[PDB]
Amino acid sequence: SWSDVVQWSGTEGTIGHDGQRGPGMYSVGIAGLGGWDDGQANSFFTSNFSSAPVKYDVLTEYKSDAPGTAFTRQWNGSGWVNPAMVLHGNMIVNGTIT
Amino acid sequence: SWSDVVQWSGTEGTIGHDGQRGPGMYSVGIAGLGGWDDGQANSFFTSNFSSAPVKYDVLTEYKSDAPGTAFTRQWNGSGWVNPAMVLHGNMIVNGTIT
Amino acid sequence: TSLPAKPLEQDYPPPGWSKTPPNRTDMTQNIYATTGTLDPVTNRLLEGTSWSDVVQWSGTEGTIGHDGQRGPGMYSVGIAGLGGWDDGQANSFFTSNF
């Protein structure tokens, strides 16, 4: 009888992976914000980016009704940590110019 | 004579597709803006991103000479629609703080 | 995963080899086949003849291609002690984050 059926021609390769997505100096607001929200930040990225945040990702969270209350954190690839030196144009919090 | 020429070795696969591009809370201005411009917004993405806008994409359009005139829309994957809750730090339009 | 060395043993099959093409559970690996003159009386290779040069016999997985490019945005970043546009700092920003 016929032998065991075996592949004879070439095989198409699978889908690989390419360069990672690039973040930006974003600025988003959350209603009723009293502090930095890791959950809201993660939800923002999951909803829009369709991918996890990447290394050195900077996102700014603030309460719009009182623009002084603003929080900025840097994603170092595993979580949100306080960045060493991040300075926005909206860094004027307590209405003071010296 | 020789038989019909047929492939004998493996075949390289084609190029697949990977995770989608991630948007951000962008803020762009258009000269002479009297309202939200779908065409200008699409031209902005086509020129810079080199790709179509993705789901939950937020872009802010404003007239720089009068910063109060600002418009923000969310791209829900098929068009620009009014977002449910988007609140920027520049949401102060009519010079009023209450 | 690579081209095996030519078998030296006259056994059918030689050590490390199988008479029938084994199932390719791992796609990255390839089925390599070599041929020789078999003696049915001894169930081994014919005296004075050996296995042919080892050649690929099954399909080959393709390499990783490239897809649509990353999309930028209307970003706004600050640098301490800035007296003018900094190409080096801008490039460092993109290399670190993007």
Author numbering:
A (entry chain A), B (entry chain A): 540 to 637
C (entry chain A): 491 to 588
Provide the authors' own sentences about this structure as they appear in the paper.
The T5 family of viruses are tailed bacteriophages characterized by a long non-contractile tail. The bacteriophage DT57C is closely related to the paradigmal T5 phage, though it recognizes a different receptor (BtuB) and features highly divergent lateral tail fibers (LTF). We present a composite map determined by electron cryo-microscopy (cryo-EM) at resolutions ranging between 2.9 Å to 4.9 Å of the entire T5-like phage particle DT57C, and atomic models comprising its core structural proteins. Our results provide a complete atomic structure of a T5-like phage, provide insights into the process of DNA ejection as well as a structural basis for the design of engineered phages and future mechanistic studies.
